[PDB]
């Protein structure tokens, strides 16, 4: 193979322009190797030399499967570059040619075409939709139509899963409803596979599909994946937990009923671990997820209480990355706006007040507004119990009054309005 190593582009062009298929093959392989080096593959040089149309025509040479493979790989690597470089591959007519290769008798060639289409679809909504219009989905799914996924080569299965997840990936617009419905059954199946990378990408795909309007969430939830997601939520591999949690988080941005599916599946039992997870991002996303659950019904808030999660929210509020603490503030405001008086009182018994007040020192304006809303909802709860006096004292002897008073000097309009109000109304 050293005979095709380090060719100049002009030598590649010379070979590809010969009338000799073997010479063209050697030149295409030399191109693949150029495009396969680690540092600065000369993608722009190869494009500028006008090689793409030739590579595309080589995709069609059924009688020379080696030049199909070499050109497929060269084009994959071009398509992996910038949008402009992917566009050059698409403009050369590569999409239908790669789709035709999906059914190749040679596994390594089929797989190469899968990868290329994943790069093209991954560029954005429009190329994703163009790949779908050219009819990629049927042949892709047919490659996974086997009794047991384990009989497929591991690398081959991972590539197929990754490409399918790109077909589920972008928005503005989201994938066509019809394409999602066609893909979902195979996705649900991959989501039960034992390989961690297949599971990671399957979850990523489900998370993409559940990121949008509630109707999108519903067509996923209706397939019965929620229990499997919750299981994966407890995996040890961070690459699996992260997308599982993203999908669960998206699903609870939906209706009360969609949210109840997640609770019934047992998700809340995993949040003591997630809300203390060593990975900052897992904590953040877990707290975000909790904030949407506490925005639910009172019976849903009650299950958060029953699962002992309020002390975990007090914990995050007391100490966490600031973005996570802001999410915790939201979780508390949502809880306090939707909860019963008894649930709200309970919050106070768990120690929510002091950490809440300490966060009034944050420079961020939004979290300050959020916290003042929470404090108002709590005072409101204490008015119905005639214990506003006692609450006022709590807030006072932990530095709270100093915070709220200072917030009258605060720049933002909505802040001083809520602050001054709290003072005159509960602190005379």
């Amino acid at each position: 193979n050293q005979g095709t190593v380090n060719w100049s582009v002009e030598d590649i062009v010379k070979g590809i322009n010969s009338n000799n298929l073997e010479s063209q093959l050697q030149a295409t392989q030399a191109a693949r190797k150029l495009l396969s080096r680690e540092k600065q593959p000369p993608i722009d040089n190869i494009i500028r030399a006008g090689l793409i149309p030739k590579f595309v025509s080589f995709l069609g040479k059924t009688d020379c499967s080696p030049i199909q493979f070499e050109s497929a790989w060269a084009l994959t690597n071009i398509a992996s570059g910038t949008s402009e470089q992917t566009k050059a591959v698409v403009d050369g007519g590569a999409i239908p040619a790669f789709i035709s290769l999906l059914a190749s008798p040679h596994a390594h060639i089929s797989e190469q075409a899968v990868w290329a289409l994943g790069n093209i679809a991954g560029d954005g909504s429009a190329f994703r939709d163009l790949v779908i219009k050219h009819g990629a989905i049927d042949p892709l799914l047919a490659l996974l139509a086997v009794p047991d996924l384990s009989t497929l080569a591991c690398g081959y299965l991972r590539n197929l899963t990754w490409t399918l997840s790109n077909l589920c990936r972008n928005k503005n617009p989201a994938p066509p409803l019809d394409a999602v419905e066609q893909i979902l059954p195979t996705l649900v199946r991959l989501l039960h596979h034992n390989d961690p990378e297949v599971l990671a990408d399957s979850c990523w795909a489900i998370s993409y599909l559940t990121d949008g309007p509630n109707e999108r969430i519903e067509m996923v939830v209706k397939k019965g994946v929620v229990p499997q997601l919750v299981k994966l939520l407890g995996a040890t591999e961070l690459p699996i937990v992260t997308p599982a949690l993203r999908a669960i988080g998206n699903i609870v941005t939906g209706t009360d009923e969609q949210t109840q599916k997640v609770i019934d599946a047992g998700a809340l039992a995993v949040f003591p671990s997630l809300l203390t997870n060593p990975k900052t991002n897992i904590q953040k996303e877990a707290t975000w997820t909790m904030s949407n659950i506490t925005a639910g019904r009172q019976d849903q808030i009650q299950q958060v209480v029953n699962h002992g999660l309020v002390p975990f929210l007090v914990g995050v509020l007391s100490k966490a990355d600031f973005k996570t603490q802001k999410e915790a503030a939201w979780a508390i405001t949502n809880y306090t706006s939707g909860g019963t008086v008894e649930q709200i009182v309970y919050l106070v018994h768990c120690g929510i007040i002091e950490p809440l007040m300490n966060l009034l020192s944050a420079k961020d304006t939004k979290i300050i507004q959020v916290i003042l809303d929470a404090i108002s909802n709590i005072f409101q709860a204490a008015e119905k119990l005639g214990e506003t006096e006692k609450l006022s004292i709590m807030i006072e002897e932990c530095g709270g009054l100093d915070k709220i008073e200072a917030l009258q000097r605060h720049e933002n309009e909505s802040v001083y309005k809520a602050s001054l109000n709290l003072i005159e109304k509960y602190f005379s």
Binding site: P41, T76, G249, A295
Partner: peptide, 16 residues
């Protein structure tokens, strides 16, 4: 007040 989200696999991969 539900709030939509609005280490993932990469959108593109080169084969080396």
């Amino acid at each position: 007040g539900k709030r939509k989200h609005e280490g993932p696999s990469p959108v593109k991969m080169i084969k080396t």
